[PDB]
Amino acid sequence: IRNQDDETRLYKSDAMSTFIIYDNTVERNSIAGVRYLRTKPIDKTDEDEVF
Amino acid sequence: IRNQDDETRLYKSDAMSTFIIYDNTVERNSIAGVRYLRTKPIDKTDEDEVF
Amino acid sequence: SNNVKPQVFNPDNVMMHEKKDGTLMNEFTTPILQEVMENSKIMQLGKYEPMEGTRAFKLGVILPVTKEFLNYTYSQFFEEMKPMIAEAFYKKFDEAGILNQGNNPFGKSIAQSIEKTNKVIKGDFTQDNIIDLEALLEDDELEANAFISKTQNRSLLRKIVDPETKERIYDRNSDSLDGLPVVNLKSSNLKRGELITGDFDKLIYGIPQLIEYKIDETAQLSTVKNEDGTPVNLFEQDMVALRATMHVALHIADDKAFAKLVPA
Amino acid sequence: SKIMQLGKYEPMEGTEKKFTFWADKPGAYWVGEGQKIETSKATWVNATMRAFKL
Amino acid sequence: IEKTNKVIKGDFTQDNIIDLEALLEDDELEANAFISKTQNRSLLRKIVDPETKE
Amino acid sequence: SNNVKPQVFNPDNVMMHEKKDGTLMNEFTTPILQEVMEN
Amino acid sequence: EKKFTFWADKPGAYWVGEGQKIETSKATWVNATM
């Protein structure tokens, strides 16, 4: 990602929360990637499943 | 295959979905090759076994 | 206990691996959704109101499950049931707000608003009755925003054509009548020949608390009696229960913004 | 075959097939502050089909 | 059909054909296709709406 | 039941948000402690 | 106008024998205005 401080930064993405959807052709270009993350606070086992 | 961007590309073809039909003569020239794949939705078990 | 017939509960709401006849659901295939999941109509039509705290009223329910059922018959049960609960809450809240059924605590409803203002049209579905229904709103400077209908009457709507333009007033593909969107209520209370409309921006709702889910393996369910009448104890009768709760709030800003068409 | 034209196919390995569907969905209760939350219940139903030989 | 008695009596007409399709949504189902005998497209070919004249 | 008013308890030890007359305890001004806690 | 809320009851406490039931208690607050 091109950061706010205007620098090219590289960060690892956890496997349990990232995946890629590929083009169906034999070339399998990557069409789109998704990251989905559970926000949770610490005090409560915050009962709703917002991602 | 000659790619759309006009480049010669090489891709491995999956052994469980490819075969070749050879000429019957002792030379066994390859007459024709076939590839067949199971397009599917993921939201359910396959509806019609379509290839 | 030494009863070899499965535990009879009262009410019989507990999910069980073993049927009353002794059949065991081993190797049980997971069910499939024969119908699409329903969505809250008043949350769809009405205007959301940012609300902190609280009028509002608590909805909730508890589902008890036998531990054997959770282990052998259907492990993912609680994870696949949560939408089915949320559906039930949406239907309860819709049935209260729209139809005044299901013991609606708010003292407010569209049905009461219309019964108060007497904004009702007696008649069969005709282009002139659809126009009169809409004019009942435009009389008070309010313009209809949508229609609420029993899906079983599309057979009636397809029979109406504009005798001037000589074309169908009801677009069966868009499911829109006279250009306004029609939402369908699956509830049994809205009869075949009844149609409702209004400026739903005048119908305001709020949600002080989105659904909490707490799963538990240790509480007592005082409301479920064993066969002998003792309360079910989850830890001790080797059992689990899922609790769901939600708070919802309803206000009708202008009770004249709603009108109803009904068979003569 | 007009049945193969109009109907839905189903992959079937054995001579018999089992279907299971939801039937009942839980209710919901308004409860007063601190009132006991009444339970509710889910339900399913089963169906089956078998093959014949031409 | 025999167990439900879901049968309409009468001639091929826009009236009866609409009623026939409506008989399905009376159970919250929508018709998806028709099965007919090619001999009768003669009858289907000669029915027209008197209002929209289509 | 579908009963929609607050549970009366005995003894009255339970704290509640809804007074049984229908008054609802929003906006609540948090009490301030006047005394100092004793050893 | 000014408004105050003060604590008006300390919650009690009990001597509970081993495995005896612990009893409950409540605090309360009082409103004042000027």
Coordinates of C-alpha atoms in Angstrom, one line a residue:
Chain A
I1 CA 0.0 0.0 0.0
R2 CA 1.0 3.6 -0.7
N3 CA 1.0 5.0 2.9
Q4 CA -0.3 8.3 4.2
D5 CA 3.3 9.5 4.7
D6 CA 3.7 8.8 0.9
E7 CA 5.9 5.7 1.1
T8 CA 5.4 2.2 -0.5
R9 CA 4.8 -0.1 2.4
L10 CA 4.7 -3.9 2.5
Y11 CA 2.7 -5.7 5.3
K12 CA 1.9 -9.4 5.8
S13 CA -1.8 -10.4 5.8
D14 CA -3.0 -13.2 8.0
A15 CA -4.1 -16.3 6.2
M16 CA -7.1 -16.9 8.5
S17 CA -8.6 -13.6 7.3
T18 CA -7.5 -13.1 3.7
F19 CA -8.3 -14.8 0.4
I20 CA -8.2 -14.2 -3.4
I21 CA -10.8 -14.8 -6.1
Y22 CA -9.2 -15.7 -9.4
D23 CA -10.1 -15.3 -13.1
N24 CA -11.7 -18.5 -14.3
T25 CA -9.5 -18.8 -17.4
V26 CA -6.5 -21.1 -17.5
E27 CA -4.3 -18.1 -16.8
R28 CA -5.9 -17.6 -13.4
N29 CA -5.2 -13.9 -13.1
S30 CA -6.2 -12.6 -9.7
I31 CA -9.6 -10.8 -9.9
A32 CA -10.0 -9.6 -6.4
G33 CA -8.7 -10.0 -2.9
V34 CA -10.6 -9.7 0.4
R35 CA -9.7 -9.2 4.0
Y36 CA -12.4 -9.7 6.7
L37 CA -11.6 -8.9 10.3
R38 CA -13.6 -9.3 13.6
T39 CA -13.5 -6.1 15.6
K40 CA -13.8 -7.0 19.2
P41 CA -13.3 -5.1 22.5
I42 CA -11.7 -6.7 25.5
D43 CA -14.0 -6.1 28.4
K44 CA -17.0 -7.9 27.0
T45 CA -17.2 -11.1 25.0
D46 CA -18.9 -8.7 22.6
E47 CA -21.8 -10.9 21.6
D48 CA -22.5 -9.7 18.0
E49 CA -20.5 -10.9 15.0
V50 CA -19.6 -7.6 13.2
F51 CA -16.9 -8.0 10.6
Chain B
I1 CA -1.4 -20.7 -26.6
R2 CA -0.9 -17.3 -28.3
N3 CA -2.2 -14.9 -25.7
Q4 CA -4.5 -12.0 -26.3
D5 CA -1.5 -9.6 -25.6
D6 CA 0.2 -11.3 -28.5
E7 CA 2.7 -13.4 -26.5
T8 CA 3.5 -17.1 -26.6
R9 CA 2.4 -18.6 -23.2
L10 CA 2.8 -22.1 -21.8
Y11 CA 0.5 -23.5 -19.2
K12 CA 0.3 -27.0 -17.5
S13 CA -3.0 -28.7 -18.2
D14 CA -4.5 -30.8 -15.5
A15 CA -4.0 -34.5 -15.9
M16 CA -7.5 -35.4 -14.6
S17 CA -9.2 -33.2 -17.2
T18 CA -7.0 -33.6 -20.4
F19 CA -6.4 -36.3 -22.9
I20 CA -5.2 -36.8 -26.5
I21 CA -6.6 -38.9 -29.3
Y22 CA -3.8 -40.3 -31.5
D23 CA -3.6 -41.4 -35.2
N24 CA -4.0 -45.1 -35.5
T25 CA -0.9 -45.5 -37.7
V26 CA 2.4 -46.8 -36.3
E27 CA 3.6 -43.2 -36.2
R28 CA 0.9 -42.2 -33.7
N29 CA 0.6 -38.6 -34.6
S30 CA -1.6 -36.7 -32.2
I31 CA -4.9 -36.1 -34.0
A32 CA -6.8 -34.1 -31.4
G33 CA -6.6 -33.1 -27.8
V34 CA -9.5 -32.4 -25.4
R35 CA -9.9 -30.6 -22.1
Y36 CA -13.1 -30.7 -20.1
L37 CA -14.0 -29.0 -16.8
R38 CA -16.9 -28.9 -14.3
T39 CA -18.1 -25.3 -14.1
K40 CA -20.1 -25.0 -10.9
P41 CA -21.6 -22.7 -8.3
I42 CA -20.2 -22.9 -4.8
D43 CA -23.4 -21.8 -3.0
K44 CA -24.8 -25.4 -3.3
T45 CA -24.0 -28.9 -4.3
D46 CA -23.9 -29.2 -8.1
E47 CA -27.3 -28.9 -9.8
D48 CA -26.8 -30.4 -13.3
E49 CA -23.5 -32.2 -14.0
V50 CA -22.5 -29.7 -16.8
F51 CA -19.1 -29.7 -18.4
Chain C
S1 CA -32.2 -41.3 35.1
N2 CA -32.9 -44.9 34.1
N3 CA -35.8 -44.0 31.7
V4 CA -34.7 -45.6 28.4
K5 CA -37.3 -43.7 26.4
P6 CA -35.9 -40.2 25.7
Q7 CA -36.7 -37.4 28.1
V8 CA -40.1 -35.9 27.6
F9 CA -40.0 -32.1 28.0
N10 CA -42.9 -29.7 28.6
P11 CA -43.0 -27.8 26.3
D12 CA -41.4 -30.2 23.9
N13 CA -39.0 -27.5 22.5
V14 CA -35.7 -29.2 23.3
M15 CA -33.9 -30.5 20.2
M16 CA -33.1 -34.2 20.6
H17 CA -30.9 -36.8 18.9
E18 CA -33.3 -39.7 19.7
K19 CA -37.0 -39.6 18.6
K20 CA -39.8 -40.6 20.9
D21 CA -40.0 -43.9 19.0
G22 CA -36.3 -44.5 19.8
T23 CA -34.9 -43.7 16.3
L24 CA -31.4 -42.1 16.4
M25 CA -30.4 -39.4 13.8
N26 CA -26.9 -40.6 13.2
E27 CA -25.3 -39.7 9.8
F28 CA -28.0 -37.0 9.6
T29 CA -27.6 -34.8 6.5
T30 CA -27.8 -31.1 7.1
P31 CA -31.1 -29.5 6.0
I32 CA -31.2 -27.1 3.1
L33 CA -33.1 -23.7 2.7
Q34 CA -36.2 -24.5 0.8
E35 CA -37.3 -20.9 1.1
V36 CA -35.4 -17.6 1.0
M37 CA -34.6 -15.8 4.3
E38 CA -37.2 -13.1 5.0
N39 CA -36.2 -9.5 5.9
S40 CA -37.8 -6.8 8.1
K41 CA -40.2 -4.7 6.1
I42 CA -40.5 -1.7 8.5
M43 CA -36.7 -1.7 8.7
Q44 CA -36.7 -1.6 4.9
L45 CA -39.4 1.1 4.4
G46 CA -39.2 3.3 7.5
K47 CA -36.6 5.9 8.5
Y48 CA -33.9 4.9 10.9
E49 CA -33.5 7.0 14.0
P50 CA -30.1 7.3 15.8
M51 CA -31.1 6.4 19.4
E52 CA -29.1 6.2 22.6
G53 CA -30.8 4.1 25.3
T54 CA -34.5 4.4 25.4
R55 CA -39.9 4.0 23.8
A56 CA -38.2 0.6 23.3
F57 CA -39.1 -3.0 24.2
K58 CA -37.0 -6.1 24.5
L59 CA -37.5 -9.0 22.1
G60 CA -35.8 -12.3 23.0
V61 CA -35.8 -16.1 22.8
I62 CA -33.9 -19.1 24.1
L63 CA -33.2 -22.4 22.2
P64 CA -32.3 -25.5 24.2
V65 CA -30.4 -28.3 22.6
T66 CA -29.5 -31.8 23.8
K67 CA -25.7 -32.3 23.9
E68 CA -25.9 -35.5 21.9
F69 CA -27.8 -33.7 19.2
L70 CA -25.0 -31.1 19.1
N71 CA -22.3 -33.8 18.9
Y72 CA -23.7 -36.6 16.5
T73 CA -26.7 -35.2 14.7
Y74 CA -25.8 -31.6 13.8
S75 CA -22.6 -30.0 15.2
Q76 CA -23.0 -26.6 13.4
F77 CA -26.6 -26.1 14.6
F78 CA -26.2 -22.9 16.6
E79 CA -24.1 -21.3 13.9
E80 CA -26.7 -22.0 11.2
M81 CA -29.7 -21.1 13.3
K82 CA -28.8 -17.5 14.1
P83 CA -30.2 -16.1 10.8
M84 CA -33.4 -18.1 11.5
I85 CA -33.8 -16.4 14.8
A86 CA -33.1 -12.9 13.4
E87 CA -35.8 -13.7 10.8
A88 CA -38.2 -14.5 13.6
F89 CA -37.5 -11.1 15.3
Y90 CA -38.0 -9.2 12.0
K91 CA -41.4 -11.0 11.5
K92 CA -42.4 -10.2 15.1
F93 CA -41.5 -6.5 14.8
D94 CA -43.1 -6.2 11.4
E95 CA -46.3 -7.9 12.6
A96 CA -46.4 -5.5 15.6
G97 CA -45.7 -2.3 13.7
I98 CA -47.7 -3.0 10.5
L99 CA -50.5 -5.2 11.6
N100 CA -50.9 -4.6 15.4
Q101 CA -50.7 -8.4 15.9
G102 CA -48.5 -10.4 18.2
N103 CA -49.2 -8.4 21.4
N104 CA -47.4 -5.3 20.2
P105 CA -46.4 -3.4 23.3
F106 CA -45.8 0.0 21.7
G107 CA -49.5 1.1 21.7
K108 CA -48.7 2.3 18.1
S109 CA -49.2 0.7 14.8
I110 CA -50.0 1.4 11.1
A111 CA -53.3 -0.6 11.6
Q112 CA -54.2 1.6 14.6
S113 CA -53.2 4.8 12.7
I114 CA -55.5 3.8 9.8
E115 CA -58.3 2.7 12.1
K116 CA -58.0 6.1 13.8
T117 CA -58.0 8.3 10.7
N118 CA -60.5 6.0 8.9
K119 CA -58.4 6.3 5.7
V120 CA -59.9 3.1 4.3
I121 CA -61.2 2.2 0.7
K122 CA -63.8 -0.5 0.4
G123 CA -63.5 -2.2 -3.0
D124 CA -62.0 -4.6 -5.4
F125 CA -58.6 -3.9 -7.1
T126 CA -59.2 -1.5 -10.0
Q127 CA -57.1 1.3 -11.5
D128 CA -59.7 3.7 -10.1
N129 CA -59.4 2.2 -6.6
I130 CA -55.6 2.3 -6.8
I131 CA -55.9 6.0 -7.8
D132 CA -58.4 6.7 -5.0
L133 CA -56.1 4.9 -2.5
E134 CA -53.2 7.1 -3.5
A135 CA -55.4 10.3 -3.5
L136 CA -56.3 9.6 0.1
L137 CA -52.7 10.4 0.9
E138 CA -52.3 13.3 -1.5
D139 CA -55.3 14.9 0.1
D140 CA -53.2 15.8 3.1
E141 CA -50.2 16.9 1.0
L142 CA -48.5 13.5 1.4
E143 CA -47.5 11.3 -1.6
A144 CA -47.5 7.5 -1.4
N145 CA -44.0 6.0 -1.2
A146 CA -44.6 2.3 -1.4
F147 CA -47.2 -0.5 -1.2
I148 CA -47.5 -3.4 1.3
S149 CA -49.3 -6.5 -0.1
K150 CA -50.0 -10.1 0.3
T151 CA -48.0 -11.7 -2.5
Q152 CA -51.0 -14.0 -3.3
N153 CA -52.9 -11.1 -5.0
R154 CA -50.5 -10.6 -7.9
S155 CA -53.2 -12.6 -9.7
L156 CA -55.5 -9.7 -9.1
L157 CA -53.0 -6.9 -10.0
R158 CA -52.2 -8.5 -13.4
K159 CA -55.9 -8.0 -14.3
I160 CA -55.6 -4.1 -14.3
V161 CA -54.7 -2.1 -17.4
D162 CA -54.8 1.6 -18.0
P163 CA -57.7 2.0 -20.5
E164 CA -56.1 5.2 -21.8
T165 CA -52.6 4.0 -22.5
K166 CA -54.0 0.4 -22.8
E167 CA -51.2 -1.3 -20.9
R168 CA -50.7 -3.1 -17.6
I169 CA -50.5 -0.7 -14.6
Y170 CA -48.7 -3.5 -12.7
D171 CA -45.2 -4.4 -13.8
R172 CA -45.0 -8.1 -12.7
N173 CA -41.3 -8.2 -13.5
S174 CA -40.3 -5.2 -11.4
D175 CA -43.0 -6.0 -8.8
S176 CA -43.9 -2.3 -8.8
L177 CA -47.4 -0.9 -9.0
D178 CA -48.0 2.4 -10.7
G179 CA -44.2 2.9 -10.4
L180 CA -44.1 2.5 -6.6
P181 CA -42.3 -0.5 -5.1
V182 CA -44.6 -3.2 -3.5
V183 CA -43.2 -5.2 -0.6
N184 CA -44.7 -8.6 0.1
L185 CA -45.7 -9.8 3.6
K186 CA -45.5 -13.6 4.2
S187 CA -47.5 -13.2 7.4
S188 CA -50.8 -15.0 7.5
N189 CA -52.7 -12.0 9.1
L190 CA -52.8 -9.8 6.0
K191 CA -55.7 -11.2 4.0
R192 CA -55.7 -11.8 0.2
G193 CA -57.7 -8.8 -0.8
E194 CA -56.0 -6.2 1.4
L195 CA -53.4 -3.7 0.3
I196 CA -51.7 -1.0 2.4
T197 CA -49.8 2.2 1.4
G198 CA -48.3 5.3 3.0
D199 CA -45.5 7.8 3.2
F200 CA -43.3 5.5 5.2
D201 CA -40.8 8.3 5.9
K202 CA -43.4 9.2 8.5
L203 CA -42.8 5.8 10.2
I204 CA -39.7 6.0 12.4
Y205 CA -37.9 3.1 14.2
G206 CA -34.8 2.7 16.3
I207 CA -32.6 -0.2 17.6
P208 CA -30.9 0.6 20.9
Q209 CA -29.4 -2.9 20.9
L210 CA -28.5 -5.2 18.0
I211 CA -29.0 -8.9 18.7
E212 CA -26.9 -10.2 21.5
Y213 CA -26.2 -14.0 21.3
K214 CA -25.0 -15.8 24.4
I215 CA -24.5 -19.6 24.4
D216 CA -24.5 -21.3 27.8
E217 CA -24.0 -24.7 29.3
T218 CA -24.8 -24.1 33.0
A219 CA -28.0 -22.1 33.5
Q220 CA -31.4 -23.4 34.7
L221 CA -34.3 -23.1 32.3
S222 CA -37.1 -22.4 34.8
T223 CA -39.6 -22.4 31.9
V224 CA -38.9 -26.0 30.8
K225 CA -40.2 -28.7 33.1
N226 CA -38.9 -32.3 33.1
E227 CA -41.5 -35.0 32.9
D228 CA -41.6 -35.0 36.7
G229 CA -42.0 -31.2 36.8
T230 CA -38.4 -30.3 38.0
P231 CA -36.8 -27.4 36.0
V232 CA -34.2 -28.4 33.4
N233 CA -30.7 -27.9 34.6
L234 CA -28.4 -27.6 31.6
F235 CA -25.1 -28.7 33.1
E236 CA -26.7 -31.6 34.9
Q237 CA -29.0 -32.9 32.1
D238 CA -26.0 -32.5 29.7
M239 CA -27.5 -29.8 27.5
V240 CA -26.8 -26.4 25.9
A241 CA -28.9 -23.3 25.3
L242 CA -28.6 -20.3 23.0
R243 CA -30.1 -16.9 24.2
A244 CA -30.9 -14.1 21.7
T245 CA -32.1 -10.6 22.7
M246 CA -32.8 -7.3 20.9
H247 CA -34.3 -3.9 21.8
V248 CA -36.5 -2.2 19.3
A249 CA -38.3 1.2 19.2
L250 CA -41.2 2.5 17.1
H251 CA -42.7 5.9 16.6
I252 CA -45.3 7.1 14.1
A253 CA -44.6 10.7 13.3
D254 CA -47.9 11.4 11.4
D255 CA -50.7 8.8 11.7
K256 CA -52.5 10.3 8.6
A257 CA -49.7 9.2 6.2
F258 CA -51.2 5.7 5.9
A259 CA -54.2 4.3 4.0
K260 CA -55.7 0.9 3.5
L261 CA -57.6 -0.9 0.7
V262 CA -59.8 -3.8 1.7
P263 CA -62.4 -6.0 0.0
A264 CA -66.0 -4.8 0.2
Chain D
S1 CA -37.1 -36.6 -22.6
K2 CA -39.4 -33.7 -21.6
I3 CA -38.9 -34.5 -17.9
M4 CA -35.1 -34.1 -18.5
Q5 CA -35.9 -30.9 -20.2
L6 CA -38.2 -29.3 -17.6
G7 CA -37.3 -30.9 -14.3
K8 CA -34.4 -30.5 -11.9
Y9 CA -31.6 -33.1 -12.0
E10 CA -30.2 -34.5 -8.8
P11 CA -26.8 -36.3 -8.5
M12 CA -27.7 -39.8 -7.2
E13 CA -25.0 -42.4 -6.5
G14 CA -27.2 -45.2 -5.0
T15 CA -30.6 -46.5 -5.8
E16 CA -32.1 -44.2 -3.1
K17 CA -31.8 -40.6 -2.0
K18 CA -32.7 -38.7 1.1
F19 CA -33.8 -35.1 1.5
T20 CA -34.2 -33.0 4.7
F21 CA -35.7 -29.6 4.9
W22 CA -36.5 -27.0 7.6
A23 CA -40.2 -26.9 8.6
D24 CA -40.5 -24.9 11.8
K25 CA -38.7 -21.7 12.8
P26 CA -38.5 -20.3 16.3
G27 CA -41.0 -17.7 17.7
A28 CA -40.1 -14.6 19.5
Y29 CA -41.4 -12.9 22.7
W30 CA -41.7 -9.4 24.0
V31 CA -40.3 -9.7 27.5
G32 CA -40.5 -7.1 30.3
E33 CA -37.3 -5.9 31.9
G34 CA -36.0 -8.9 33.9
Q35 CA -38.8 -11.2 32.9
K36 CA -38.2 -14.9 32.1
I37 CA -37.4 -15.3 28.4
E38 CA -39.6 -18.1 27.0
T39 CA -38.0 -20.8 25.0
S40 CA -38.8 -21.7 21.3
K41 CA -38.1 -24.5 18.9
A42 CA -36.9 -25.5 15.4
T43 CA -38.2 -28.4 13.3
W44 CA -37.3 -30.3 10.1
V45 CA -38.9 -32.9 7.8
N46 CA -37.5 -35.7 5.5
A47 CA -38.4 -37.0 2.1
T48 CA -36.9 -39.8 -0.1
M49 CA -36.8 -41.0 -3.7
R50 CA -35.8 -44.3 -5.4
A51 CA -34.8 -45.5 -8.8
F52 CA -36.3 -48.0 -11.3
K53 CA -34.7 -49.9 -14.2
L54 CA -35.8 -49.7 -17.9
Chain E
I1 CA -53.0 -33.2 -9.5
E2 CA -55.5 -35.9 -8.6
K3 CA -54.8 -35.7 -4.9
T4 CA -55.0 -31.9 -4.8
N5 CA -58.0 -31.6 -7.3
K6 CA -56.1 -28.6 -8.7
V7 CA -58.1 -28.7 -11.9
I8 CA -59.8 -26.0 -13.9
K9 CA -62.7 -26.8 -16.2
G10 CA -63.3 -25.1 -19.5
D11 CA -62.1 -23.8 -22.8
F12 CA -58.7 -22.3 -23.7
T13 CA -59.2 -18.6 -22.9
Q14 CA -57.2 -15.7 -21.4
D15 CA -59.7 -16.0 -18.5
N16 CA -59.0 -19.7 -17.8
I17 CA -55.3 -19.5 -18.5
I18 CA -54.9 -16.7 -16.1
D19 CA -56.9 -18.5 -13.5
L20 CA -54.8 -21.6 -14.1
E21 CA -51.6 -19.8 -13.4
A22 CA -53.1 -18.1 -10.4
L23 CA -54.0 -21.5 -9.0
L24 CA -50.3 -21.9 -8.2
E25 CA -49.7 -18.6 -6.4
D26 CA -52.7 -19.5 -4.3
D27 CA -50.1 -21.8 -2.7
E28 CA -47.3 -19.2 -3.0
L29 CA -45.8 -20.9 -6.1
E30 CA -45.2 -19.4 -9.5
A31 CA -45.8 -21.3 -12.8
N32 CA -42.6 -21.9 -14.7
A33 CA -43.7 -23.6 -18.0
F34 CA -46.6 -25.2 -19.8
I35 CA -47.0 -28.8 -21.1
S36 CA -49.4 -29.1 -24.0
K37 CA -50.3 -31.3 -27.0
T38 CA -49.1 -29.8 -30.3
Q39 CA -52.5 -30.6 -31.8
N40 CA -53.9 -27.7 -29.6
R41 CA -51.7 -24.8 -30.6
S42 CA -54.5 -24.2 -33.1
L43 CA -56.7 -23.2 -30.2
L44 CA -54.0 -21.2 -28.4
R45 CA -53.2 -19.3 -31.7
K46 CA -56.8 -17.9 -31.8
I47 CA -57.2 -16.3 -28.3
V48 CA -56.7 -12.5 -27.9
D49 CA -57.1 -10.0 -25.1
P50 CA -60.1 -7.7 -25.9
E51 CA -58.7 -4.8 -23.9
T52 CA -55.0 -4.5 -24.8
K53 CA -55.7 -6.4 -28.0
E54 CA -52.4 -8.4 -27.8
Chain F
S1 CA -47.1 -14.7 28.2
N2 CA -45.7 -11.8 26.2
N3 CA -45.7 -9.7 29.4
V4 CA -44.1 -6.4 28.9
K5 CA -43.6 -4.6 32.3
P6 CA -40.8 -4.9 34.8
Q7 CA -40.4 -7.9 37.1
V8 CA -41.2 -7.1 40.7
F9 CA -38.6 -8.8 43.0
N10 CA -38.6 -9.7 46.6
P11 CA -36.6 -8.4 48.5
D12 CA -36.3 -5.2 46.4
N13 CA -32.6 -5.7 46.1
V14 CA -32.4 -5.8 42.2
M15 CA -31.4 -2.6 40.4
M16 CA -33.6 -1.7 37.5
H17 CA -33.7 0.7 34.5
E18 CA -37.6 0.8 34.3
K19 CA -39.5 2.1 37.3
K20 CA -42.7 0.1 37.4
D21 CA -44.9 3.1 36.8
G22 CA -43.4 3.4 33.3
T23 CA -40.7 6.0 34.1
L24 CA -37.5 5.1 32.3
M25 CA -34.2 5.9 33.8
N26 CA -32.3 7.5 30.9
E27 CA -30.0 10.6 31.2
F28 CA -29.1 9.4 34.7
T29 CA -26.9 11.7 36.8
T30 CA -24.3 9.5 38.4
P31 CA -24.3 9.9 42.2
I32 CA -21.2 11.5 43.9
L33 CA -19.9 10.1 47.2
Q34 CA -19.8 12.7 49.9
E35 CA -18.0 10.8 52.7
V36 CA -14.5 9.3 52.7
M37 CA -14.3 5.5 52.9
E38 CA -13.3 4.3 56.4
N39 CA -10.4 2.1 57.3
Chain G
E1 CA -31.2 25.7 38.6
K2 CA -28.8 23.0 39.9
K3 CA -29.3 19.3 40.6
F4 CA -27.3 16.7 42.6
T5 CA -27.4 13.0 43.3
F6 CA -25.8 11.5 46.4
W7 CA -25.3 8.0 47.7
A8 CA -27.8 7.4 50.5
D9 CA -27.2 3.7 51.5
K10 CA -24.1 1.6 51.8
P11 CA -24.7 -2.0 50.8
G12 CA -24.6 -4.4 53.8
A13 CA -22.4 -7.4 54.4
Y14 CA -22.9 -10.8 56.0
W15 CA -20.9 -13.4 58.0
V16 CA -21.5 -16.6 55.9
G17 CA -20.5 -20.0 57.1
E18 CA -18.7 -22.3 54.7
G19 CA -21.2 -23.3 52.0
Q20 CA -23.9 -21.1 53.4
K21 CA -26.0 -19.0 51.0
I22 CA -24.6 -15.5 50.5
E23 CA -27.4 -13.0 51.0
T24 CA -27.9 -9.9 48.8
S25 CA -28.0 -6.2 49.4
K26 CA -28.7 -2.8 47.6
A27 CA -27.3 0.7 47.6
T28 CA -29.6 3.7 46.9
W29 CA -29.2 7.4 45.9
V30 CA -31.1 10.6 46.7
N31 CA -31.8 13.6 44.5
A32 CA -31.4 17.3 45.6
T33 CA -32.0 20.5 43.7
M34 CA -31.2 24.2 44.2

